[PDB]
Structure formats: C-alpha cells, structure tokens
Design a protein around this nucleic acid. Structure first.
Lengths: 77, 277, 63, 91, 77, 94
DNA sequence: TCTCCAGGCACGTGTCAGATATATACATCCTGTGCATGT
DNA sequence: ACATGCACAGGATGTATATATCTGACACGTGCCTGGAGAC
C-alpha cells in the first residue's frame, strides 16, 4: 500500500521526520475516500489521529476540534 | 471623523474606526460597499458598528437584516448582543414552526423602527433567505449585511437571485475574497452592490477582464492604463486592509513543494486513462 | 339577567385579550430561549463510561 | 381514546417487517376492526337470543364467524379461532 | 342557488372516473338532482344524531353513523 | 391522438388518482345550503364536510358505473338521463 | 368483589434517507439558424 | 429562384467529488393511571 502511491510513499518519509521533530500536522484532502484509505495507513504506522469531513456532525465537529487542541497526543488531524 | 457610536459597549481598534467612517460615508452618499479586510481582521464589529451609528444619530433603529452562513449565526447573535446591548436580535432559523412564530415579530407597517420595537436586527442564513424568500420580499429593510458574501459570487446562484430582489436601501458585503477564480465573480458582487453602475457583465469582460485573464492564463502584456482605470472604478466601493498593517505580530509561513514520481501501478493506470481518448 | 349576561360577555371578551397576550408573549419568548439560549453535549454515554472505569479503578483487587 | 392501533402495528411488523402504514390508513384499518367486531358480536347476540340462551360462548362466536365470513375466509377464520381457544384452554 | 356550484367539469370528472366516454348535456342537471336527494338523506340523519346529542355542531361521527344507517359505511373517520 | 383516444386518456388519469373531484368550497356551500332547511345556524366539523364529500363522490362514481352499463346495454356509448333513472330504479332508490 | 401494578397512552425528542442547491472544472449534446448546392 | 440538408454558436445539459442544509417519520424515553389480571 504505502509504495503503490508515490504521494503516500513520500508522505511516509515526511511524517516520520515530522513526528520525530514533535510537530503536529493538519493534513488536508480533497477526497474523503482517500481520507479513508489513509485512516488505514495511519493505523499501520500507529499514529494518533482525528478526522473532520463533511460527514462529521456539528457538535461532533466541535468535540473533535476541541480534542486536537486540548490533548497533544494527537499527531495528525 | 465620526466617533465610536456611543451605543457601542466596547472600544474599536483604529482600523475598525476608520472602517466605521468609510461605511458612514458610503451611506450619506447613497453608495453601497464591500468590506474586504483580509480574513480575520474583525469585519463583524464594523458592520454592527454602522448599524448602531445609524441608530444613535438618525434614530433609525431597524429593521436590519444579517445574512450569514448557517454555521455562523450563533457567533453573530452573540456579537450583536455584546457590542450593542440595546439591540433586540430576532433569530430566524428553526423548523418551519419555529420560524412561523417568529414571523409574527415582523412589523410590516412601520417603515422605520424606533427603540421599543419587536426587533432590531434579524439574523438569518442564506439557505433560509432563499427558501423563505416569499416572506423576506414583503419586508423592507433599512440596512443589510451579507457576511461571507462569497456565497453570492455567482450571478447564476439562486442565492444571488433572491437576495438581489430584496428591497433594501443599503447593502454591505463582507468578504475577504472579492475575487477567487474568474473576475466574473467580482462582477457578481459589484452588480449586487450597485446594479446601475455595473449594469453589464459583457461590457465588464470586454473592458477589463479579458486583458487581466490573459495576462495570467497566457502571459500576455498587462495594459497598465486599463488596469489603473479599473482600480478607479472599484475604489469608492471596496475597502480591503491586510494583516501585515494591523495584526503585525504573527510570523510568516514557509511553503514547500514536495515532489513525487508515480509508482509503477500508478503509471500503468495513468496511461490506460490516456489511451481511452 | 340578559343585561347581566351582556355585561358578563364584555368581561370575558376583555379578559380574552389579556389571556391571549400573556400566552403569545410567553411562547414568543420561550422560543427565543429555545434557540439562542442553547449549546450542550450528547456523548453523555462517553462520560458515563469514563465514570464506570474510574469506579472500577477505585477497587484494589488481586485475583 | 382507545384504538386498535398498537395491535395493527404489531401485526403489520409481523407480516411485512420493513413496511410501515400511513396515519390515514391506520384510521381505515381501525374502522375495519371496529366494524367486523360489531358485526360478529351482533350476529352472535342474535343467535343467543334466538336459542333462548343468555351467554355468548365460543360456540356462538364460531357460528357467527361461519354466517358472516365467506367461503375460504370463513373456514380459515374458524380454524384460527379454534386454534387460539385451544391454546388458551391448554395454558 | 348553490347547486350549480357543482360544475359541469366536476360532474364530467366523476363520470370519467366511472368509465364514461361521452356525456349527453342533460346529465348535468340530473346529477345535481340525484346528488341533492342523496345529501338531504345523509344530512337529515346526521342532524338528527346532532340534535339528539344536544350539540349545535355536526361531527364526523354523525356523518359516519348516518352513512352506516343507509348501507353506505364510510371507513376513515 | 385520433378522436375518442383523449377521452380514454382522461378516464385513465381520473382512475389512477385519489384526489377529490368536486371543488371543496362549492361542496361545503352546498352542504350548508341543505343543512339550514333542517336546522338553522348549524356548525360543522371541518372533517365532517370531508366525510360527506368522500361519501358523495363515491356514491356518484358508483352510480355512473351502473349508468354506463345501462347505456351500453341499449347499444349506446353516451349516458343519458334515462340511464341514471334506470340505475336508480333497479337499485331501489326510487 | 377488593386489590394491585404494568401495559399502554400522551408527549417530547432527535436523527437520518432522500432531497434541496453547488463550488471546482470541463466535455458533451443540442438545435436555431445560415449558407451552399441541387433541382 | 427556392427548398433542403448539413455544420457552426454558444448555450443547456451533463459527469464527478464532498460541502452546506433540511425535513419528517420513526424510534425511544418519560410519566402515570386505569383496567387487565389475581383468586376467593
């Protein structure tokens, strides 16, 4: 999976460096289907993440954004 | 050089007070205006400010209509409540039933409201403005703010169609992006603001757009004199201010293009796509 | 008696305006409070689960 | 204000589980129930008064059902009723 | 003279629902007569139940009872 | 469409819909016009007038079916006052 | 007949399947109408 | 000279990704009370 996409392969390198730096990432997509695929990848490399897309209900939005902002364990949104 | 409307239970920053002025003049002289401060400079407070000024001096207390994105209504309602405590806001969102009751607050007989009215500012979404346009069209509005005015960037949008047909003296668009995409979408706003002076998109194209759109799209020469003449035409109707002048404290962004070649599978798919032509 | 009843009808009709105005104004205000007054949560279940886990931890056990 | 709604709903979700029924249709079905009730009960009462009895037993209800409902409808109705009364007696 | 408010088009539509291809022009006034006689019979009974109940308002049940009394049971009320 | 076909189309249109075929306010005014011959100043539940209308339209539609068969028996495709009266005659409404 | 309580009824509530427009781009289908050719 | 057929103009329709809103019907929770059930 991570090598069948050139972007994904390059994102992997960059996220490893970002993590080791203690950076926290908003990661933006134009396709929610891709948001799903990735969701997997992130599980494999075992990084903590949130999700907010047009499916995410309004008070759940508030909740998720507040998390990302409250609890620094989450690395990617 | 006006004074912070005294009905305003806060103090404006410098630029909001210069921006107040602009909107006070754009009224005295009949003009409308886009307030296009770059995103995050405090556009809401300047709008509420104009409305409060109106009241204090001209004793015109209503009705004012704020249309906004649905997501933003509570923020608007709270901001109005904070900055002009005396302003009775009427929320106008809710199920059909909720809205039906609220419609009973609309005084259609008084042309101009005074302090003890049912309501002063009505706050409502673009979606409602369009579904309930039947109702909104009967009312006659003393001022109107569209916030996140990029919502009516298309002249073919039902949203622009509806809102253009509202009887209102005064419109104030708020949007930090008058243009995004074509310049067409700037004509849309200009026509909404002042349909007299920008009465024809085609003229607009011929005289300004096709030059500027070719200078970007095909790297032609930019006609300096034409461009200056456009700015001129825009200048009394659009105010834009930028963070580097008024929110100086933030450090800059670093942008990095990160380049990737297709993997094998990607390529063999890309090329079947190309061969399907 | 008929005159008394006419007077009584004026009384009930006068009272109807006060009774209508009171309910209309109250229900108008209740709805503004229904919408603008608002903002809460629903993960109530999440909170309950957290409380249950805390209660389980409060118990020392060596089985 | 009592209606055989509840029960019409339980029967519906037993025979066509994912299908609903409209409020108007529920009204019509409730009227149907009331009408059939009335007819059967009344014929049963008549049979009782005609045989000088003063009680509407299972046997009155059976004969009412056989007079009222046509052919296969009558037969199947008799069957269901008999089955139900049998189960009741057993319990 | 409200009977002619039952319009020629209204009668035509009802004849169409009843499977009628062509309508002789004398039908319209017969249909009004027939309808008026029928309504009088139902309303007289409905009013009779209404009076008995010591009501001033005719209710849906009064009409349903009047129709059942005349062998034209109406389901739905 | 060739003549007579539009009629069969109209019949189909009216046989597939469930809408009421008499206008509501004309029928309501007829009900009140009849009612005041039996007792003056009668009030009606909104639903009572609709119950009368549904029954009345159902009656007329059923009568037109019987009327149609009377015409067709006489080797006609046109219904006439005679056909209504025979239908009413044999139904025992006379 | 004296006794009990739970099933059902009235009332809120909340949510989500199918529906209302659409920014973001562009290719495509459409057909009014004009021009050319043939009879 | 007139009529018919064939291709430009540029518009409306269309394809695809989520967004931004919404509405009404279904399901579920609450409160309570009367009538279905007990059994002598």
């Amino acid at each position: 999976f991570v090598t069948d996409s050139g972007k994904l392969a390059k994102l992997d390198e960059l996220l490893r460096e970002l993590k080791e730096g203690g950076h926290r990432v908003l990661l933006y997509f134009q396709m929610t289907r891709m948001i799903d695929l990735m969701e997997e990848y992130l599980t494999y490399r075992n990084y903590k993440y949130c999700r907010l897309d047009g499916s995410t209900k309004l008070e759940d939005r508030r909740d998720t954004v507040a998390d990302f902002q409250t609890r620094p364990e989450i690395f990617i949104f | 050089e006006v004074a912070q409307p005294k009905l305003l239970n806060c103090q404006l920053k410098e630029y909001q007070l210069k921006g107040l002025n602009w909107l006070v003049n754009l009224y005295e002289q009949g003009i409308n205006g886009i307030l296009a401060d770059e995103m995050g400079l405090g556009k809401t407070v300047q709008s509420i400010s104009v409305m409060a000024y109106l009241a204090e001096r001209y004793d015109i207390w209503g009705p004012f209509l704020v249309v906004a994105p649905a997501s933003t209504l509570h923020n608007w309602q709270q901001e109005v409540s904070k900055f002009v405590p005396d302003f009775k806001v009427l929320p106008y969102w809710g199920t059909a039933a909720d809205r039906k009751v609220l419609r009973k607050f609309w005084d259609r007989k008084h042309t101009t409201y005074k302090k003890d009215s049912p309501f002063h500012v009505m706050i409502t979404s673009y979606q409602l403005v369009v579904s309930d346009v039947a109702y909104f069209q009967k009312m006659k509005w003393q001022y109107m703010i569209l916030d996140e005015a990029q919502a009516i960037k298309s002249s073919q949008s039902s949203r622009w169609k509806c809102l253009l047909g509202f009887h209102c003296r005064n419109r104030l668009l708020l949007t930090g992006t008058p243009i995004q995409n074509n310049m067409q979408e700037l004509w849309a706003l200009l026509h909404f603001i002042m349909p007299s002076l920008f009465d024809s998109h085609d003229e607009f194209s011929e005289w300004f757009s096709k030059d500027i759109e070719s200078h970007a799209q095909s790297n032609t020469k930019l006609n300096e004199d034409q461009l200056k003449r456009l700015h001129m035409i825009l200048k009394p109707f659009m105010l834009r201010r930028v963070k580097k002048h008024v929110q100086k404290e933030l450090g800059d962004k670093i942008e990095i293009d990160v380049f990737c070649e297709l993997s094998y599978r990607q390529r063999a798919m890309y090329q079947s796509l190309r061969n399907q032509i | 008696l008929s005159m008394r009843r006419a007077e009584m009808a004026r009384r009930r009709r006068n009272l109807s305006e006060k009774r209508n105005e009171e309910i209309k104004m109250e229900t108008v205000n209740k709805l503004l409070k229904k919408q603008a007054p608002r903002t809460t949560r629903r993960a109530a279940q999440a909170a309950a689960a957290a409380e249950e886990a805390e209660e389980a931890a409060k118990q020392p056990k060596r089985p | 204000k009592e209606s055989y709604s509840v029960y019409v709903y339980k029967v519906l979700k037993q025979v066509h589980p994912d299908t609903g029924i409209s409020s108007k249709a529920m009204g019509i079905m409730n009227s149907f129930v009331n009408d059939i009730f009335e007819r059967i009960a009344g014929e049963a009462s008549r049979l009782a008064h005609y045989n000088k009895r003063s009680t509407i037993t299972s046997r009155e209800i059976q004969t009412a059902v056989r007079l009222l409902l046509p052919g296969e409808l009558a037969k199947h109705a008799v069957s269901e009723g008999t089955k139900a009364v049998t189960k009741y007696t057993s319990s | 003279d409200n009977i002619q408010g039952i319009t020629k088009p209204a009668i035509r539509r009802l004849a169409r629902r009843g499977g009628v291809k062509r309508i002789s022009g004398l039908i319209y006034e017969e249909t009004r007569g027939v309808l008026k006689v029928f309504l009088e019979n139902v309303i007289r009974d409905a009013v009779t139940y209404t009076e008995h109940a010591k009501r001033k308002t005719v209710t849906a049940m009064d009409v349903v009872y009047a129709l059942k009394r005349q062998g034209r049971t109406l389901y739905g009320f | 469409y060739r003549p007579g076909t539009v009629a069969l189309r109209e019949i189909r249109r009216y046989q597939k819909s469930t809408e009421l075929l008499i206008r509501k306010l004309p029928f309501q005014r007829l009900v009140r016009e009849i009612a005041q011959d039996f007792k003056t100043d009668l009030r009606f539940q909104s639903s009572a007038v609709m119950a009368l209308q549904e029954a009345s339209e159902a009656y007329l539609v059923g009568l037109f079916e019987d009327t149609n068969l009377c015409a067709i028996h006489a080797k006609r495709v046109t219904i006439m006052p005679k056909d209504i009266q025979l239908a009413r005659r044999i139904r025992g409404e006379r």
